[model samples]
Target chain A: KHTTIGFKIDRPHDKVLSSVLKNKLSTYVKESFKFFKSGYAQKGYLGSENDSIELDDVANLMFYGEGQIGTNKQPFMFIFDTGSANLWVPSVNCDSIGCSTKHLYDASASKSYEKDGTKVEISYGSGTVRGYFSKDVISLGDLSLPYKFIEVTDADDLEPIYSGSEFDGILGLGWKDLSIGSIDPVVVELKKQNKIDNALFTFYLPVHDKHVGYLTIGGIESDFYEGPLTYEKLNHDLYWQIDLDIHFGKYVMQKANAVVDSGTSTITAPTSFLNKFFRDMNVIKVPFLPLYVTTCDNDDLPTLEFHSRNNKYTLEPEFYMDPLSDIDPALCMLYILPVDIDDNTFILGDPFMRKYFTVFDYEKESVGFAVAKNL
Target chain B: KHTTIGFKIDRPHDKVLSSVLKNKLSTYVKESFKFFKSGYAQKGYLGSENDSIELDDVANLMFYGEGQIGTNKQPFMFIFDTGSANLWVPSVNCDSIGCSTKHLYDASASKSYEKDGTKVEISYGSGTVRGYFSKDVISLGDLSLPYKFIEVTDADDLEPIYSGSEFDGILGLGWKDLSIGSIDPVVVELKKQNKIDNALFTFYLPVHDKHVGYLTIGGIESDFYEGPLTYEKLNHDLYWQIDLDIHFGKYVMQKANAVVDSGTSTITAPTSFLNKFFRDMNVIKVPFLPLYVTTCDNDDLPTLEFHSRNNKYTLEPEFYMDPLSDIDPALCMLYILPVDIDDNTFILGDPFMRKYFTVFDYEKESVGFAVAKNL
Candidate 1:
C-alpha cells in the first residue's frame, strides 16, 4: 500500500504509525508529515534572547522529520530535502564533533545493513559532506524499502553548524542526475521497488499554527491544500529547477533559472542582481552579513511577482520580511540573501515553499505549486 | 420570492443585476455587495500622498453601497449602518451645504412618495441630523418594500463631514428600540411586511481583493463564509451589544459591554481604560487626535484574546495596526481610538467585523460570527 507519514516541528520529533485503507493499494496516515521550524523562531520573533543574530543563515537550518533505518528500526532525524538527490546520515565511525553530538548509524548493529564502502565527498548548498555508500532497509511510516544511502563519517564543511543543529542526516529527494556517485534517490528507489503508486512527493510547510505540516509520498492528499496546482516544466533533471520571471515596478528579471530547494532556509539571488533589487526597495545591506534590513513599518515595500508560463505567484512584504518583533522592532530583516557563487540562478528556498504547497513530480519532470491551507 | 443585489466600490461605483433561481423562492445574485475601503487606503500604505493624516478618524468614512428610492428610482449612496435604527437621506428642501452637495430626495417627483409631517432630530455616533418622516417605496436589488424614512432638511452637526463624504444618506439596520421616535428598523419592516423569509442579515466585508464583499439579506450565503457560526446573545435590545472579556497577559477586562456598530470605522474603548491599554502596548498618542501610534516593526506586541462564552477570538498586531506603508513606513498607526463617552461600554466596529463574518440575527435577538472566506 502507498504510505503517508506524519511528524511535528521545532521540538524533538516523533513518528507514529496509524494506518487506514484509502483506495485498496493506499495506506492513509491519520496526521501528515511533521517538520521542525527551528531557525528563525530562535531569532526571537516568538520571544527569546537570541533576537540579534540572523539564525536563518545557519547551514542546517531546515525542516527535520524522523526516519528509521535497518532491522533494529534505529530512528534518526532527517531533512526530507528536494534540492539534493543523495541521502546521507551520521555514522558511528565519524570522529567529528558534528557526528558525535547527533544520532549515528552503526551498520554492524543491524542484520539488514549491507556495507558498500565506496568513499565519496559531495558539496551541498551550504556544506560538504564526506561519507561511504551503504545499503539498508529504510523504513518511512509502514513502507520498508531497500535503498542505497551514505553513512557519513565526516561532516567537513558542515562543522559547528551541524553539531548545533537538531537534525542528524539529510535524505535527498531530488533527481538521480544530481546524486553522489550515481546512487538512485529515495523516491526513485521506492518507485523501482513498486512500494508507491506514483513517482511524485508533495510537501506542506506550515507557519505558526496549531495544525502541523506534512510530507506526502506517492500522491497528494487534498485535505492539505485548496484549488488546482500550477505545474511549471523543469529546466533540467538536476535539482527541482524551474524558469522564473520576477516582476517589480518597471523592472523585470526574465527567464531566470531558479531551484525549488527545500534544504535552504532563505531565498537567495545572485549578488549583482540582488544589490540592484534591494537598492530599488531602499533596503540597506547589513555590514559584513549577506542580509538586508529595512524600516519595519513600511507596508509600501515592493512585491515580487513570479511569472511562470501563464501563472503568476506573488511574494508580498509580509512573506519576505522577518517579523520585526523578532529582531528589533524598528527594523525588518529581509529574508533574501545575496549569493556570489558564480551563478545567476535564484534559489527559492523555505521562504518561498512556506507560501505554496509544492509538488516535485518525476513522471512529468515538472514542479507544481498550489495555495497551501493553514494547518 | 427573495432578492439579492450586486454593487462595486472605491472609484465611483456601478450596480449590476444577474439573478438565478435557488431553491424555489430565493433569487441568487451572482455578485455580492460592493463597498469602498477608502479611509485606511487613503492613509497611503498603498503609495498615495495623503499619508500624513489619520483618515479612519474622519466621519462618514464607512462603506457606502447604492440604494434606489421612489417610482423614479432616484439612485443614492447609502451607509447600511448597524449602529442606528432610522433611515434618513438629504431632502430636496435642504439649504445646507451637506444637502446641496449630495443626492437629495424629492417627494413631489415620485408618485409612490407620501408625506407625513412628523419632525424628528436624531444624534448619531459622529453627528446629528434634523428631518421629517415620509412614506416611500425603497428598492434594494429587485425587492420593493414600502417603508417610512426620514427626509433630512438640515444635517446640523454632520456639516463639512457629510459634504465631503461619498455617501448621501444612512439606512439604519439596528433594533427597533434604538430608532428615533420608536420607528421600526428597515430589517424589522422587511420581516413585518413578509418581504424576506427570515429576519436576519449577514455581511462579508473584504479587504484589498479583486472579488468584492457582500451584504446578504434574509439568510446566510455559504459561499461567503466557512464552517458554523458561533452565535452570542445580545446584552441589550437598544443595540447589537455583547459581553466581551478581553484577556491580555496577566490583565483581563472582565465582562466589558461592546456594541457591534458598522457605522464606526475604528474599535473604540473608554478613555481611561484605553490609555492604560495603549500604554501597555507602548503606543503613543498623537497630540490632538484620538489615535495612537507605534513602531511599525514590532511583531512582539501583545495580542488581545476576546473571550465570548466558550469561543476565544484573537486580535493580532497585524489586524489592529495600520499597514505602515499607507502612512509612514517608519511608523504604524494603531486603528484603535480612545472614546471619552459617559458610558464605559466599548464600540466593536468595522475592525472586529473585518475578521469575523458577522450576522445581525434579529430573529433570535442575537449576533453571530464565523470565519470569513476570501472573495
Candidate 2:
C-alpha cells in the first residue's frame, strides 16, 4: 500500500539558528579547499564569520516526522533529507553534549538488532558525523523493512546543529551511490526487497505552517498537487541534480546545474550571478554583509522562473520575500543567497520546495515537479 | 489512413551539388544581419565563396517523393521539408528560368481549383521565392485534403537550386506560425479536417544509399526505428527548436540552442565552436579554406554526442565523416560546417537525421528522436 507520512514544521529556535550560522561560518573558514577537491565546496560556503549575522533567524525552518525502528518499535523524530544517503541516530555509545540531549539508539535492547561493528565517517555539507553500522526492523507509517543503518557514536562535530534540535536523527533519501561503501539507500533497499510499490518518493511541502506537509513513499500523491509533474533526467546519480535556466521575465542563466535539496533552508546561486542579478534589480545590500533588501510592496518585482528545458517552475515575489516584518515594515529580506562556487550551479532549497510538490524516482532516474494545491 | 511515402535518394548530381555550395557561399558573403533579424541566419551561411571548393560533392543528398495536386491528380516530385512551412510548386502562369524546366501547377485544368489570388513573397534562408495562393485538392500517397498552397510564379532566384533539380516543389512541415499570414501548415490543416489520426509526422532517413528511407504522415512508423522516442519540449513554436548540449567525449558546449531541419544537407555550428572543436581534434584546415579534414580510419575518433537534457543522441565518427575518397586515400572531409551566426544555436541537418528517426508533433509541441533501425 502507498503510504503518506505527515510531518510537523518546527518554528525557528534561537539555539538552532545560531548553531546553523556557526556551522556555515566554520565551513567557510576552514574546509574551503577540502570541499573544492571533493566537489562539496558549494554547500555551506556563504562567506566570512562576520557575515553570519546577516542571515535572518527565520531562515532555519525544519521538517521532521516520527518513525519506528527495531523489533520493539522504538520511535524517534527524523529529518527526511533528500540530500544525503544514510540513516543515523545518536547511539548509546555517544556521550557528547549533543547526543545526551536527544533520543539514542540502544542496540543491546532490541531483539532484532544484528551486530555490525564496521565503523564509518561521513562529512556532510554542514556537519561531520561518525557512526557504526547496525541492522534492525525499520517502519515508516505502514511500510516495514529489515534494514541496515548507522548508530552515530561521535556527533560532537554537529553539536552546533543538534544541541537544541527537535529531530533526533536524519533519514537520507538520496541514491545508493552516495551511501558509504556503495550500500543501498533506504528507498533502494525497500524497492530491491519488494517492500514498496515503486522505487519512488514524493514530497509535498506546504507553504503555510497551518497546512499539512507530507512525504509520500512508494508513489505520487496526486491529490496534493495540481496538474501532471514535469520530469527531467538527473544529471548525476549521487544527487537529484538536473539542468535548469533561471529566468527573470527573460532568459538569465542558461543551463544552470541545479539540485532539489529539501535539507537546505534557502535558494542559492553563484556569487557572480547573484551580484549581477542584485545590481540589476536595484536592491541594496546591508552595511557589512551580502544580505539584500527591497521594498516589500514593490509592484515591479518580477516572479522568478526556472526553466527545465521548456517546462517552467516559477516563484512569485511573495514566496521569495521574507515574511517577517520586525526589522522594517516597508522592506523584507530576499532569500536568493550567494555562494562562491560553480557559476552554473544553483541550490533549490525549502523556498522552492514549498511552492512545488517534488517527486524523486530512483528507478526511473528523474526528478519531477508540480505546483502544490492551495491550502 | 496513416501513410508511409517511400522517398528516392538521388546520387550526387554535380550541377545540384555545385549550386548548393554557391548558394551557401553567397549567403555567407551578404545578408548576414537580415537572417539575424528574421532568425534565418543559421540556415546556409558557410564561410566564403572561395572556400566552396573544399565541400564534398556527396554532401548534397536529397530525399524526394511523388505527390499529386488538383482534381486531375497532377503528379509532381516534392521535397518534404520540415524546416519551412508552406507548399509551393512552379506555376504555369510564369516563365521563370527555374519554372520552365519543372512540372507546373496548372490551375486552369483542375475543376476543383479555387482562386484566391494574393501575391506574396518569402525570403527563404537560401533563396527568395515569390508566389500566389490557390486552393486545390492535394494528395500524398493515400491521404487527400482540400488545402490552400502557394503557386510560385517567380522562382528565378532559386534557379541555382532548382534549375536541374529532380524535385518540382517543396512540401513544408513546420508550425503554422512559420507560414505566411499564419496559415495552417499542411499537417495542421489535415489534422483539423480529420484527414489524419494525429497531428504529427515522422522522418526515417537511411544511412546506406541502398536502404529505404520514408516520410510517414499522421502517426509513427514503429518498424523504422529502434527503442522508444525521447521527447523534449520545443523552445519556440516557429521551428522544432529545443535546448541541447554538444558532447565530444566530454561536454563541449552547454545549453546549445538547436533546430531539427530536414531541408538542410549538413550539420552546422557557430564558427567559434567549430574552430575550437577542430583544433582540439588535431584536425587540419585545407589551404585557403575553413574546411577541416581528419584520418578516415582513425580509431581514436570519438562519437559525437548530443544531450537533450540527459537523453543522448550520439553520432559515430563514421556518420559524420564523408564517404568520398577521391581527394586522398587516407583523408576524408568532415561534414560539420561553420556558420557565423548565434554562437549557441546549432542546425542538426541530414547527418544527424540519418542516425535518428525524428518526429515533429504539432499537437504536443515537442520533438522526439530515436535511433534508426540498421538496414
Candidate 3:
C-alpha cells in the first residue's frame, strides 16, 4: 500500500526567489552558454544581476511548501524547480545574504549527520551554491525518510551584482539522471519510500484563490483539468524539456529545445531570437539597462507564437514585457532577455506555468499541458 | 509557369479603412453566440456595431489595397476578410454613416453597370447594407475583371452606437459555396481571370516597418517566412474556419468552431465561457458599460490556449485586454467580450493574425499557418 501526502504553501509569498534582491528587470544581451549544450546547459545557480529571472518582477511569483530536515526537524520553505535535481539549504555557519533571513541546518544537532566528505559546487555569475553532502531523516508534508541532501556550508554574493534573496532553499524535482554528484533526489526518495501512488507528480499552479494546491505526487488528479491532458516527449538528458520553434510575426524562427523551468522567474531565450523579436516588434534596446525596450503604447505588438507538437501556443504581450520601476513610463523591458547560447534554447519559467496546466509525467517521461486556471 | 503578385498597401494610408472617424479598446462580459456560429457563420458581413471591426478605437485600423469599381473607375479601399463572402460597397445615394465621406458607386456613370433586378440586404447591429445587383469592371492594383458586386442603395445605422467605420466596404474572401446568392467571391474571381499563378493566396500581417504588408495572390513568397507553412482544413460551407478547444485552467471548455477573421477587431467568445473566465481571472465588470474589467496590473493572467490540429496554441493577456486609456487607468476592458448565442462559437480576429502567418489556400481550400516575424 502506498501513502500519499501534500503540502500547504501559503499564498502572498513565493516571489522571494528572484536572484535580484536589489533592482530593475533588465539584462545584458551577450555571449554565454559557453559551457552548456543549448538550453540544457546552465548547471549553475542564477546568481547574476539581471532582475534574477522575470519572476523577480512578477506578482506572487508563488512558492513551494515548508518541510523538515534531519532529526532536529529543521523547517524551511523550499523553491521547487523541475529544472534542478538536488535538495539544498544553508548550514548554520553559512553567512550568505539569502540565508540571513531563514532557518539553517545545524549538522551537530542531527544524529544521522553522515558527511562522507563529498564536496561539490555549481558556479553562477552572481554566486556559488556549493557544499558537502550530508544525510539525515528528511520529511516533506507528512512523508519522511532517511535521505541524502546538500548542506550548503558555503554560499554568498560573490559578485558585486548579487544581493541574495529569499526562499530558504531549493528542492529540485528533476530526475536522478541529472542530479549533481548522482545524489538521490528528494522526489526519488519519496517514491522509493512508497510515499506516493505512482512514479510521477503534477504541479497545479493556483488558477484561483485558495492555498488549495495539490503537489500530486505519484499521478495527476482527475479533478485538476477539464479535458484530457495533452502530453509531450520529455528530453532524455536534461531538465524537463520540449522541442520548440517560435513564430515571430506570422512566420517561425529556428527550431530549438526549451527547458520547462519552475525556478526561473521569467522566460529566457537566445540572443539571436531576441534580436529577431526586437526588430519585428520594433522594440529598441536600452543603452544602460540590460534589456530590449519598447513603447508602453505599443498596440500593434504581435503574439509570441510557439510552434511545437504541430500545435501552436501563444504567449501574450503583458507576459513577455516586464514592467520594471517606471523610471521611464514610456518603455518596458522585453521581460524575457536573450543571451548567447550554444544553440537556440530558452527557459519557460513561472510566467508560462501560470497559464498552461503543466504536469511532469515521470511515468511517461513526458510533460502534459492543460488549462491551469482563470488567472 | 507559376507567378505571384504583390502590393504596397503603405502603412500610413491603411488607417483610411476604419470608419471610426475616431476610439479605446474595451469589451463587456456576457452571452452572445446568439448572432451566428463561431467564425463559421459570419458568412456575409460583421453587421454588428461593436467597434465596426478592427480596433474602432485603434489609431488606424488599416486596409486592403485600393481598387477601382465600375467603368467610371471609382477607386476605394476595402477590408479583405477571408472570414466573409459577398462583395459590397456604399452607393452614391446611400445615407449610411460609413458612406458619408467616401466615393460611392454611380451606376449611371459606369459602362459595364448591369442591373438584373437582383435585390438583397445584409443586416448588422451597426446598420444594413442593401441594394440591387450591379456588374462592373473591377480593377485592383494591376489586375482587373468584370465582376458582379453588391450595390448598396438602401442603408442606415440602426443605432447611434455604430459610427460606421473605415474601408469603404468589405471584399469578402470566403468561398463561393458560402457566398450570398452563390455569387463568385473575389479570390475565386481572381482565379477565373488567371491573375494568379496558383490558386492559393496568403495574408502576411506586418512584422515590422511602417505596417507595410502584402497580399500574395498566387503563391507564397518564401521571404515572408523562415519555415514551411502548416495548413488546416477549411470548414466546407462557412467563413474560413478552424476547430477550437480552450483550456479553462487545467480543464478544457466545450469544443467549437473558430472563425479566422481580420475584420472583427478582437476575439469574441460565448457568454458561458467568458463568465467562467471572469470568475477565474478575478475580473470585475463595469457598472454601466456592458463590459467586464480587471486590475490593470494583471501579470498573472492565463494564456488563451487553443487546441487544434492535435496541437495547442496559446495567447497571453495583452491581446485579450483592450488598451487602458488615460481616461481610466485603473481598469482594463477584458477586451474579449462574451455574448450569448445558440451554441458555442468565437471570432479570432486581427489579434490572432498578428502571430501566425496565415494563408487562405483556395486550391487546397484550407488555411495554412507559419512562423512569421519578430514580435
Highest-lDDT candidate: 2
List, for all models, the DockQ compared with the true complex.
Answer: 0.01, 0.00, 0.01
Best-matching candidate per TM-score: 2
lDDT to native, each model: 0.66, 0.71, 0.59
lDDT of 2 by residue, B1-375 (tens): 469888765533334325425433323211221222233212222333333332233334345556898888898888766666788887998788777778889999999999998888766555777888889999888889988888888988875777866778877888643335667888988999998989999888888862346778899878878987899899986888899988765438888888786555567777667766765564543322334466677666688888876598888887777733433446655767776447688878778888899998999999899998966
The 10-residue segment of model 2 chain A with minimum total lDDT is A28-37
Q: Name the lDDT value of residue B291 in candidate 3.
A: 42
lDDT of 2 at A309: 66
Once fitted onto the true fold, the runs of candidate 1 whose alpha carbons sit more than 4 angstroms away are A1-375, B1-61, B208-212, B342-344
Residue range A151-204, candidate 3, lDDT tens digits: 776666433323344566767778752335876566666677786666666766
Ranking by lDDT: 2, 1, 3
- What is the Å distance of residue B177 in model 2 from its true position? 74
- Model 2: per-residue Cα lDDT over A181-267, one tens digit each: 667888888889998888999988766653347999999876889987889899887889999888754438888889887766677
Task: Output the worst ten-in-a-row residue range by lDDT, candidate 1 chain A.
Answer: A27-36
iRMS, model 3 (angstroms): 23.8
lDDT per residue as tens, model 3, B337-365: 55442367777765666666778877787
